[PDB]
Amino acid sequence: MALRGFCSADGSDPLWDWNVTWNTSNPDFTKCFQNTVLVWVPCFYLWACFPFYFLYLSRHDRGYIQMTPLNKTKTALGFLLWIVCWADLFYSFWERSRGIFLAPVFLVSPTLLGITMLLATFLIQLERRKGVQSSGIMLTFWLVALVCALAILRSKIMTALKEDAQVDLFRDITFYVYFSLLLIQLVLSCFSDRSPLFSETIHDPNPCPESSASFLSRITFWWITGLIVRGYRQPLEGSDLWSLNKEDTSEQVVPVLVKNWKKECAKTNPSLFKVLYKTFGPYFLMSFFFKAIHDLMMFSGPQILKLLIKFVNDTKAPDWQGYFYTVLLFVTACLQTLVLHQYFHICFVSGMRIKTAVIGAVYRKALVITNSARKSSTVGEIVNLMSVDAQRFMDLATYINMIWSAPLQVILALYLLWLNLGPSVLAGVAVMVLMVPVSAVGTFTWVCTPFLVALCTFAVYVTIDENNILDAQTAFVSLALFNILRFPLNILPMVISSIVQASVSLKRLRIFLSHEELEPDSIERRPVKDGGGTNSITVRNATFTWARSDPPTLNGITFSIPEGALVAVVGQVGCGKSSLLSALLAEMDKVEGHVAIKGSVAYVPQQAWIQNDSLRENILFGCQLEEPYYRSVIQACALLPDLEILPSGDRTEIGEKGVNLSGGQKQRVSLARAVYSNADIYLFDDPLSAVDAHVGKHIFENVIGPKGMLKNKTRILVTHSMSYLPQVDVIIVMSGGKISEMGSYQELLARDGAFAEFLRTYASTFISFLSIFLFMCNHVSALASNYWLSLWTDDPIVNGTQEHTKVRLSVYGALGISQGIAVFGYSMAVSIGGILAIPEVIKMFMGSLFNVIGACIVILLATPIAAIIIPPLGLIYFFVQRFYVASSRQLKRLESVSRSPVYSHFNETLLGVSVIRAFEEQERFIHQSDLKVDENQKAYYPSIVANRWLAVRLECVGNCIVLFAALFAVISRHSLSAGLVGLSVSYSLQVTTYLNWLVRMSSEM
Amino acid sequence: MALRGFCSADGSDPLWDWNVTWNTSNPDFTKCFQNTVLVWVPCFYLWACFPFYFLYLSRHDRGYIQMTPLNKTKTALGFLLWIVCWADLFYSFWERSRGIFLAPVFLVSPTLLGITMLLATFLIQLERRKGVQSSGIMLTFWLVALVCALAILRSKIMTALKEDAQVDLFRDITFYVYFSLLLIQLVLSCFSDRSPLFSETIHDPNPCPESSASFLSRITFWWITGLIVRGYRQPLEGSDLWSLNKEDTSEQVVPVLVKNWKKECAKTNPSLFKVLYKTFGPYFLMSFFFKAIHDLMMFSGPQILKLLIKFVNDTKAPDWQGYFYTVLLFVTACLQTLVLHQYFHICFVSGMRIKTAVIGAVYRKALVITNSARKSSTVGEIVNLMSVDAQRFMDLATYINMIWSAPLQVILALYLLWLNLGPSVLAGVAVMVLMVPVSAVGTFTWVCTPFLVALCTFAVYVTIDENNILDAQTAFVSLALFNILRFPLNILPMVISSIVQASVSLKRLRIFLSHEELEPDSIERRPVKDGGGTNSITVRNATFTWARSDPPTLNGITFSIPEGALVAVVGQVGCGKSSLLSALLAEMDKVEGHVAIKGSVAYVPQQAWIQNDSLRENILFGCQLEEPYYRSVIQACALLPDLEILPSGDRTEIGEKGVNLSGGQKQRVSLARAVYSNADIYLFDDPLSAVDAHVGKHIFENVIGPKGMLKNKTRILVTHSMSYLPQVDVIIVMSGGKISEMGSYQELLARDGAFAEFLRTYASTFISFLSIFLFMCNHVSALASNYWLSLWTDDPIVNGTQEHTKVRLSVYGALGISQGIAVFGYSMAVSIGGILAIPEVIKMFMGSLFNVIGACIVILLATPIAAIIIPPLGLIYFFVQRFYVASSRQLKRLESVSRSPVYSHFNETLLGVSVIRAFEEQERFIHQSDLKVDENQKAYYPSIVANRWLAVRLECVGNCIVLFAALFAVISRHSLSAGLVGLSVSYSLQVTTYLNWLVRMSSEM
């Protein structure tokens, strides 16, 4: 109790005295309210965020915009605001020093205002020091200070010119200067400054404008318009889309996730959710503070509706009060929009981010992991993992924040119902429980559902007791609250289902990513580790097996050979020569054994794989061009006859998505790639399996034979031939995975040992008018029913009831049952017409058109002057709708056609992981699979941006029609009953919802 | 009288009544006025504008913008606007059909509106088909129609909600739709449309934005804003300026003038003034219909001010009339500014066109006429004529309208003042005839002249009458009218001097252009018409004379020679060798004879002409250096030693603006040009007179002699040398106007006649502070005088006369004497300061700044609230002045730089007309001059454009401060005297004028 003696010595300034600010015809805050609250509100608002912005901006340095004249003038005007707000204090000090005792308010509040102005100037300077041009806080701070100064200035102007008033002419001039500088600063701070000195734009010529746009453009999503209008005349395709903003790209997002996941693995199992929350979480804190605000505004709307309806029925309420409602509502609605679509977008963006991160991780954990530990089918269990269990993490972004908001709303709505209908909630909750369990007939019952719930609730309310009256207030507030509650009751189902399927997908992603089979960490040293050596093959105590749970198959393997002696391996059918070489690939699990290899080596499988591209690209595999290598790489392989028959020679799309080849052709192209790889020794797996006798002999004598070009290279090959063995000096013979004999062919032949036994054993060497009439009847019946409700809620209150209750309910039920009969009839008619000779699209298009038309006709009926705003809004609506519909199909086709390449590339990489890992080049494929997904995301992002643009435009149109349907019903309150104004005001929210549904569903088909 | 019965049968609805529209406190036009005049005004406007616009656009086709959505929506809105008017007509017909009589006003006013809307739609279609971006008529028509519909709508909304008003709710909704559409079309007509399909844009990358700019942009000069902001940081130079726009280019403007002058000359000698009118007249008429409107608004202003002052004085008048007056004043001032500064641009553009056309015409006329008919010097009368005349025909563009303007202004001001005062203004003119005859004291008296004239007028008015009171109306009216009239009085002089000087210049230009002497029409046979013949020169009975009255000097010239024959012409000094050469080049008049020649002739001028350029550029004369013949002629003419000693070889700057060379070097260069010319007939006139004997003999043996490579061509010689005479095949002896003898050297020697005689006879082998204090004293004295006059004009009237006045006049005179003493003292102080150690610039900077500060505090201490408006006008004005000065000084320096080159090129061409015509090349230099003039005017145009930009931005600010001074002094009319309000309103126009003076003069520093 100090404010009375704080502001004036005696005390005659009761703060918020309702006898001056509310009840009069000239509302005005008390002098002390103006001096204290209207000054401290903006200062406290700015001081609250200064911590947060100093914490956030010091981590996001972007540029050094140096000395733009806007910065100079803003700093100068901030200093001028300081000097005036300090001169006010100095004049107060001079007055108190040599004059009348002065209240402490005049000696305290200007000090705080001056301090706030200094902080604003310093924040502008620091905001310039960092690379942010258009402030998102300076605009709002100046706006709030300007609103408060506007209130104070209105009070001062009204107080001035009453009659010869004796006023202090120092706190007038100074305040006018302060308000003028406030307006100047607010207008000035709406412009974007220069670009940062060293911006990210160095080579990209088409960057997305979101990284550099004014605050209003970001709020209203105005930077998409550039490609929407441009997307109307010339069809959109490919390169017209922008480039990503360097923070959604895969090469920037993925490393954070992979390092966090590997740190979590080291710390240990708990799922990656526990890290998935801590990597993309801090971007959700802005998706939770932007849902509570919109949620509060959604409920705060109908309270303003109730206040307006109560005021209308007050014939003695002061006029201006009405306006004070009809503005506030508008503003509130607008804020809700400018918050709701600032949440969705953020959420949506984060969801898209999730995708790339997972796509970055699974790929990077697929081509360098799980050596033979991959028992899930390559098709339908790994690429399908990517597709399904990563496309499910963009919906969970949208459906996660509802798990707390959707229930809350419900109960809060129910709470308000209790506060509205009181004991009638006992029947209202019963009717809602009846409606909870509640095809064309089904859809039309859903259409009539608002009528059904209204009829049931009103009937039970009027029949439970004779002590309750159905005035406009309770009826229309209940209608609005039911319309609000409808959406969460529809959203509560399938949200739990989405959470469940996302949990299943999370389990699958964990069970894949938690393989952790880092088998090729290091099992042997670098093959060609020393540049100089003598022995090619050396081995001792070699033990190798397919997996951990298999008995050993290789024991007592100990032999060696220098460089220069032709060596080949001979094994019986099923003896394990293929598995032996597979173990020799250094791609298996080793218990013990010492093996030495020397020389650069590449790989050639016995099951050749073809990358889906041209023959030339398959041969290149990274190199630019070396002409002699190509001219000498085809004659040796004898690919001239094979290249000539090809439809396009060395240009056709070989392999899959092209002309098929024989197995020998795949073998030949693999050998050509291998000999292009430029190694010193090579690995081959019987490449001449299907080659003809003459062709095989020619190929062997061309290169592989002693006269071949690669005779300078020691020979490492496998085969099961017989005529190819005698030319080999020493034959490596495996007997049950163990060496048989070592020595030259002459020595073993003279020995007459195992080889002699092998040779001896083998010895191989009327309705359209009806539909229109029924539609018109149904819609005019609905409009007449609403008009009848408006008339009924205006009945006089005599004898504790209305003028007559039974007849009103009887006729209400009568035309409701008539409407039900009509809807059943035209449902049957339209179903028969569709079956006898897509129909749903036309039905809902006509329904929504007629609903919007009926709402407009109701608005016109209430106040004819409303016809002022029906044309200009409608045109605007059209000039949005068309555009979006003409620029959302293309942005959907691009995104849908760009999705397949990433999955096809992942399947390609998964099929031939052995070959790419063998060639010691696994980084180009990562770049390719990152670029493809980056292109897909670059195509996908403008789709959601345009969706937000369209939604904001439609919401603004709906808010404008709300405001201009309340204005004309407040101006003419003296000739319109409460029912008319209540119905007209309640219909505009449904106008907004109908417009949004019509745009989203009807024309998009 | 017929209109009264038109409104209604009973005449209960008049067309006007002061008791319903002006007397009450709720003004509203009567029913008939709203239904007839407000509905016919825009329609009459458009129907009157239609024929002139159609005729103007019939000859200004620019493109075929086909089907832009803007055109489609505008056409749809036009059709839907016509349909509502036809609906009104049909409703009136249906109502009158059954049983109702409704008067014919409802059958005519909606009848013609449909026609007007259909005409608007057709005009939009035609404008689209004729390639106009933003309409200049449609926007104004929509604005006028919207104003009328706004008045009608306000009347309708006020009438409807009065008390149980039974209004037919069919015309109301129709009119609401009509108003809505009008608003939509007005806001849509501010959008620029697509560019025309085909235009001049095929190579120009930097076009002027004037050709493609919205109507609300060319009115306010908004594009120069782009070039002006860029000029603040980076300097403006060279290619930064915009290229011209096909209308100011010299290539297309000169042909019209030259063709029309040729036609005028062929008619007859009337001056080119007559053809100047018909060539550059049609564009100047728009500068006539604009000056009158500004002259009318400038006087409509003071009457509005007087009405506002009278309303402020009266207390029983309603409170809305003052707002009407203060809005009309602002609208009138804004329209006056726009009209005046759109007239000035037209005037200056016409002046620029005159200059370029005259320059081009003079250049084209100069270089191929007046052969040997020039008695004046080549310098000081042609190039001086060019420069001075062309630069004197731009100021006449601005000064020509003053001769018709002055009367309208002076007689109208005299009329208004006489209607105000009468005999008092008779004494007024008796006092103005004191300043009619009308140095620091002189400047100060000039500054104080309005105060002195007001003091004298008021003193005489109150002394000679003593029965008329100094009111508030007549006084401030007199001040405003005198301020208006001051400028034309000073501007009328120097106009007649400008006209006299321009007449002198026009006469001298006419006499230069009429010096048409095309002597070389045709005299001899065509030299190179064919390409065959054996006789080189065939001349018989040739007579040539220098002048018309001079006796003939050549007679009996009859000789001939075949091709490839050596001829030498030998004659004594004064025999006529120079005249023979002049006649042989075919540039002198012939009376009789037959002369024919075949083949291209080598021109050997002993006089040297060199243009300041690179040496090689002079060498080529426009050709290339592909052929190696240049090296051959360098070697043959022994030019290698000449080239070696050059500072940079063939790159050193030869000719003027460079190094100097001897006569022999220039002769050798000219001989090189002659051998580059590729001639067939070779003539020689002692070109080696200044060359050394050995060098001359070597060059003679090189090229001139029979041993030269050009020996296969005819050679004819003339000189006084004796060494080369024995080696010539044939000799012509020229003496006494006749050929003495004809024959070969052997036969002439055998004759022993003239040749023998020639051989025998002719053969050889404290101050700062004092000034500040005095300035402050003078300004506070002026402020005290202003306060005293404000008090004096508010004195009560008792017993016929007013309060004590003689003491007020005495103290006013004492204050004037003190002000004179102060100005004398500080003029002495400033003179002492200047003589002890631009000063006028600083003096009047002080004066303007102090006066604007004093006026700002004067408006401050009349309405304190007005302090809200000082910051956001001072900041805007300061920024505009800074931008203008910074971006205008640079491109004024550009014009200073780019003025000399055109005159230098003209002198260069004039001094070498002989050579440039001898070798038949007179087209490249025309293009060079056109390019130079085009560059100069391209750099000069933005100067006037930016001047208009600054002026508009300053006049708009002045109008805004005038409005806010005339508004804040009406809201509180009760507590202000008439004198204070009149002073505050009257001082704002002087504030605007002082602002313009300050910016221009005291910022061009």
Ligand SMILES: CC(C)CCC[C@@H](C)[C@H]1CC[C@H]2[C@@H]3CC=C4C[C@@H](OC(=O)CCC(=O)O)CC[C@]4(C)[C@H]3CC[C@]12C
């Ligand atoms: C109490 C009475 C005297 C009325 C108050 C009026 C003046 C004290 C103030 C009001 C607004 C002020 C102006 C507000 C903004 C500016 C911009 C400012 O521009 C700069 O200096 C920025 C560029 C730079 O610093 O180079 C120059 C001073 C000026 C004109 C100020 C000059 C002083 C003004 C006219």
